[PDB]
Design a protein around this nucleic acid. Structure first.
Ligand SMILES: [K+]
Ligand SMILES: [K+]
Ligand SMILES: [K+]
Ligand SMILES: [Mg+2]
Ligand SMILES: [Mg+2]
Ligand SMILES: [Mg+2]
Ligand SMILES: [Mg+2]
Ligand SMILES: [Mg+2]
Ligand SMILES: [Mg+2]
Ligand SMILES: [Mg+2]
Ligand SMILES: [Mg+2]
Ligand SMILES: [Mg+2]
Ligand SMILES: [Mg+2]
Ligand SMILES: [Mg+2]
Ligand SMILES: [Mg+2]
Ligand SMILES: [Mg+2]
Ligand SMILES: [Mg+2]
Ligand SMILES: [Mg+2]
Ligand SMILES: [Mg+2]
Ligand SMILES: [Mg+2]
Ligand SMILES: [Mg+2]
Ligand SMILES: [Mg+2]
Ligand SMILES: [Mg+2]
Ligand SMILES: [Mg+2]
Ligand SMILES: [Mg+2]
Ligand SMILES: [Mg+2]
Ligand SMILES: [Mg+2]
Ligand SMILES: [Mg+2]
Ligand SMILES: [Mg+2]
Ligand SMILES: [Mg+2]
Ligand SMILES: [Mg+2]
Ligand SMILES: [Mg+2]
Ligand SMILES: [Mg+2]
Ligand SMILES: [Mg+2]
Ligand SMILES: [Mg+2]
Ligand code: NA
Ligand code: NA
Ligand code: NA
Ligand code: NA
Ligand SMILES: [Zn+2]
Lengths: 53, 122, 123, 53, 80, 50
RNA sequence: AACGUGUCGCGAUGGAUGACUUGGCUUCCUAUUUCGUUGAAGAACGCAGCAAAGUGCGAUAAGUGGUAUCAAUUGCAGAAAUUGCCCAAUCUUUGAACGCAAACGGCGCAUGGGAGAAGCUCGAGCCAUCCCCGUGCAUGCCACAUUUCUCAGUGUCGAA
RNA sequence: UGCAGAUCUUGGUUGGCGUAGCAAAGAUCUAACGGAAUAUUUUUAAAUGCAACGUUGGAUACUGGAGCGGGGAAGGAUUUCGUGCCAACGGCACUCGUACACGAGUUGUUCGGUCACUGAGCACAACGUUACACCGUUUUGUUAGGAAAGUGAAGGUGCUCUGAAAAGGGGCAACAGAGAACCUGGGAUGAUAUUCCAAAAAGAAUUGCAUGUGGGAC
RNA sequence: AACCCUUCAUGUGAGUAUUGAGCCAAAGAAGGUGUCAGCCCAUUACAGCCACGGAGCCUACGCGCCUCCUCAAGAGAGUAGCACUGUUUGGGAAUGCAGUGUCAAGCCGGCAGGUAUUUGUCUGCCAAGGUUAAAUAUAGAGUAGGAAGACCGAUAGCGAACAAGUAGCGUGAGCGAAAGUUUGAAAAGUACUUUGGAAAGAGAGUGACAUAGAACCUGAAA
RNA sequence: AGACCUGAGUGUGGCAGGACCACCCGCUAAACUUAAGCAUAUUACUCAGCGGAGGAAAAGAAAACAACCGUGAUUCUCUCAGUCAGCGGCGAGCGAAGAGGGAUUCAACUCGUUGCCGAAUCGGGUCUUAUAUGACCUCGAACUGUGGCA
């Protein structure tokens, strides 16, 4: 039920990053998936390792 | 009071008993020494008790109670087991009415239960 | 492992910080669940959710007693929210109350005083 | 008083090369087209049902 | 051609899912349900089908609130 | 085709998630009576429509 | 000869019979015994470490709180509570369904909050556009305006 | 409360019988590899392990653009992709599969819908009728014996009063009518793309709001 | 212990059964436990004991204190009646009711008294406004519980002893099954050797019995 | 300019709407069938349809029976009675009431009207531990009549 604007704000609060694009789709099973692109000033790999990947 | 004139009703209540009702149902007699010391005929069985089997294949065996499987109406005793095909040893269930209690595990709650069950005057 | 007895003394601000803290490990446990960590961590999920539920129970209770105290004043009984009032049934709410069902006229009062019931017995 | 008669059964009539007993409506159940309502039919009504008077 | 050939001429659909009862009985063109008569306030109930009545009556679902209020009545609304 | 309401999409999603076999550890429980799922569905045998 | 026929012993195919029964049917009795705009009955979607159906529950989601009892649950994990009863709570989208609509998870008005990476002021404060959330807003009828609200009539009278 | 028959009911079994057949849409061949499906013998080579399956190369031939080509609507809803796999199923066969199992995949300021139009039409409100609304009217400019406008022109005050004019309540109905600001390239996939690409954005654009500065006017 | 004889090996599950001794009974009651149990377990009682108990009901209309309170006329009007029409009743020259027309009396009143009319007596009541417990129903209802039965016993009994108003069928209103998981006291549910791609076969093992091997008691007929 | 009458807009506090429906109350309302045919009759003032409640509902306190040596609200039971009551192509068929023995029962009250009074009444606010059957105020409702006595 969330939209793109709230997703962008929530990611910033949880992980302290800045985004340039948010894309969303609804999967065939009913779950919503989001692609979030980070700014060039932030490393996606570094953030992923911080969360634990 | 499960027992009644309606056999269908009595059997339904027994086999659909909740867990706390099942604890009372699986009780065992006390030994002669315990009976003379507490004036109590029987007690419900709990873990870490010591029992002696009086009926069945393991007649005369003694051991410690390792489980009270209320879902299967049995108890598990150490050293009372069987060997599987591959060499694993597994416990064998025994009904609580075929054994007798030799040593009691005592705490504050158990001592209170024994006191309220005592049959003495004054 | 907060326990209900501990949470009684705390104030609203402390409870919110505790609630905000507890949600973090729940999120961290969920991401670890995708990384198929050992079942020892998977036991912590149930504990955290129970801890969260206890905090929300205390917060809701404290808010409700505040509103009841505020609206306990007379001449505000018409302004009290309906959710804070007694909910017996639809039928019982609209039924005649004790002070109305037993109303009597002046003539009835005098007649009852004149002819009271008696205990007599015979022989 | 309703036992064995809670069906909307009807006889197929003559000309279908079957007996004239009433049969069950519908399809797709393995009960469709089976005999009904008769004291000689499986799941039918018994002869002279017992009364309480 | 009234048999097998004409079966291939059936294209659209008369009914869709009903918003109130969930059955496939909502007439798309007339905008009303053949099973529960929605959007009429009352639903359908006929004494020539007691079997149909017993399929839809109280107790065939969850009784989410009725269970609670029945317990309160049995305990004569005990409270603190 | 391409078009469908979101409500219809969620109904098809639930049916897809339901089309699963019984877990193996269920069959080992005490007093178990279930052997296989009797509500398995195939798209070419029975139609949900919707 | 072979095919074919018959009898006895044994073996297949099939699921009758008997013994079992936490099911049905029928009659009788006792209650602090009878739902809902304070949103019911029904309908949909979700929730467990492994969980399809069924059961229980509702983002506090196989449960929170109280009380009695007193050590388990159990397929494997996992830990070192469970069960019965019940006061305190939570209670998603709908439905009489009631802001307006509807094969749309759509669109408003008023009011109160929240986040905010442009801009401004001196790393913080104020934050435009955009976005999120709570509450109120159907129709009809009754009573009141208790500081006695605002009106309409070539209806009946009536002063300057 | 006793069964041999009711074109009796429900299950099971049965000769016919390895029978009738499995004959429209022209058709396959060869070598190598794969596969448990071979080149299988004790009691020289042929006369004692037949028949059949997938991929690649080569040959032959068909569809013949009104196509066993490439995209959509209705309908279907995971049949899509990779890996494994042959019990049952594809009336012959399978090592193949739209079968079975386990995991994956659908990215939009500009595409379709909607925000936001009317049509053949529908029927909330209002009114009337009916023992009973679950009935009737409701686009020939248009509801209702019918008081359904809550908008605000010029003017005054200050940096917020008074009032001109406007008849005919509220909605829905077109994914082929009206309307609608984006195009190519890609080494960007196993599967999505006018939807993904980030500093030499591969790039080049068009449009909706808010702002701040430079400039013309109040 | 299977054509006959001889020799060598194998085979009896669990004592609620049998016998002999006792004991309890204000309790002999019918459920469970590896076979038939008063004394193995749970039960079987007040001729009882504890916790919680907001409102409600009951008790010299329970019991104190303060406040309050108390101790000549008339009688139901578009009503009753009558006519026509219709319906209903055992109600018959009209039992009740409805539509329209007409429409009272009360200084010798009105209604009823089961054959129509006019007149005179007698008897009983006093319409056209309202409230009211108990004794009665529950002929496909509910919430909690109890008592049971000369009833049925898996093609029977509810359609449903089971993930049953489920699977499945129909555009729809609707229709609607089959199916006892009844192996064994206990999974002790067949390790390991060997042939086979596998499925399985031949041995071995558990169990008193495997011709009790897994939808596994008994296992008929065609 | 101001009253009264009639009628609107808004605001504050409330109620109705749906479900269940075995039994109960009001309306509407068949045909198969029987008559060895069939039209009045019967099935039946029943099934189907519409509306409305409860733990029961409805009824209930004489404009009642009777014709006696008189009973005394309602409801239910046995009986009266398949009736030498009665209705009916007087065919098929249909069909009650008073009385008598019982269950229950401290069971009965009231408005309007007539006579004597005439806001003593209602709503709202404040006070008394109190939305008192109390007290005080109220250019609020009510004299086109709320209350009290016989
Ligand atoms: K299509
Ligand atoms: K025993
Ligand atoms: K009249
Ligand atoms: Mg998108
Ligand atoms: Mg029938
Ligand atoms: Mg039957
Ligand atoms: Mg035709
Ligand atoms: Mg056509
Ligand atoms: Mg059509
Ligand atoms: Mg349409
Ligand atoms: Mg579709
Ligand atoms: Mg709405
Ligand atoms: Mg026979
Ligand atoms: Mg042939
Ligand atoms: Mg042929
Ligand atoms: Mg050709
Ligand atoms: Mg050619
Ligand atoms: Mg084949
Ligand atoms: Mg598949
Ligand atoms: Mg039009
Ligand atoms: Mg177009
Ligand atoms: Mg577009
Ligand atoms: Mg593709
Ligand atoms: Mg009178
Ligand atoms: Mg009455
Ligand atoms: Mg059956
Ligand atoms: Mg067998
Ligand atoms: Mg209603
Ligand atoms: Mg009710
Ligand atoms: Mg008949
Ligand atoms: Mg006839
Ligand atoms: Mg005839
Ligand atoms: Mg009826
Ligand atoms: Mg009454
Ligand atoms: Mg009659
Ligand atoms: Na083509
Ligand atoms: Na439109
Ligand atoms: Na059946
Ligand atoms: Na005849
Ligand atoms: Zn519907």
């Amino acid at each position: 039920r969330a939209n793109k604007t709230e997703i962008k704000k929530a990611i910033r609060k949880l992980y302290q990053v800045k985004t340039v694009k948010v894309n969303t789709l609804i999967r065939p099973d009913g779950l919503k998936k989001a692609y979030i692109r980070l700014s060039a000033s932030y490393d996606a790999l570094d953030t992923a390792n911080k969360m634990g990947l | 009071g499960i027992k009644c004139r309606n056999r269908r009703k009595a059997r339904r209540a027994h086999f659909q008993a909740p867990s706390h009702v099942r604890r009372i149902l699986m009780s065992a007699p006390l030994s002669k020494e315990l009976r003379a010391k507490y004036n109590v005929r029987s007690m419900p069985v709990r873990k870490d008790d010591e029992v002696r089997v009086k009926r069945g294949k393991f007649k005369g065996r003694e051991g410690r109670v390792t489980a009270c499987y209320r879902l299967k109406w049995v108890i598990h005793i150490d050293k009372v087991s069987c060997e599987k095909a591959n060499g694993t040893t597994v416990p064998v269930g025994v009904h609580t009415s075929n054994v007798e209690i030799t040593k009691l595990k005592l705490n504050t709650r158990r001592k209170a239960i024994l006191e309220r069950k005592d049959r003495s005057t004054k | 492992i907060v326990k209900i007895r501990d949470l009684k003394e705390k104030g609203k601000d402390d409870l919110l910080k505790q609630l905000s803290e507890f949600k973090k490990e729940l999120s961290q446990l969920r991401v670890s669940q995708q990384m198929n960590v050992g079942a020892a961590r998977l036991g912590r999920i149930r504990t955290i959710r129970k801890g969260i539920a206890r905090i929300m129970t205390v917060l809701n209770k404290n808010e409700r007693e505040n509103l009841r105290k505020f609206y306990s004043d007379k001449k505000l009984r018409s302004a009290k929210p309906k959710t804070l009032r007694a909910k017996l049934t639809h039928r019982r709410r609209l039924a005649l109350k004790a002070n109305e069902k037993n109303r009597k006229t002046r003539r009835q009062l005098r007649m009852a005083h004149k002819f009271p019931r008696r205990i007599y017995a015979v022989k | 008083r309703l036992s064995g008669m809670k069906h909307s059964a009807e006889s197929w009539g003559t000309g279908r090369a079957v007996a004239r007993i009433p049969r069950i409506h519908g399809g797709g159940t393995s009960m469709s087209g089976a005999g009904a309502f008769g004291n000689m039919c499986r799941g039918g009504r018994m002869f002279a049902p017992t009364k309480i008077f | 051609t009234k048999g097998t050939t004409s079966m291939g001429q059936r294209h659209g659909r008369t009914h869709i899912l009903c918003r109130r009862c969930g059955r496939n009985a909502y007439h798309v063109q007339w905008e009303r349900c053949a099973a529960c008569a929605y959007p009429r306030a009352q639903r359908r109930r006929y004494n020539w089908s007691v079997k149909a009545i017993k399929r839809r009556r109280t107790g065939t679902g969850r009784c989410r609130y009725l269970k609670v209020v029945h317990r309160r009545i049995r305990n004569h609304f005990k409270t603190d | 085709g391409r078009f469908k309401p979101l409500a219809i999409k969620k109904k098809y999603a639930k049916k897809l998630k339901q089309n699963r076999p019984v877990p193996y550890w269920i069959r080992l429980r005490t007093g178990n009576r279930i052997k296989w799922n009797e509500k398995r569905r195939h798209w070419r045998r029975t139609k949900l429509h919707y």
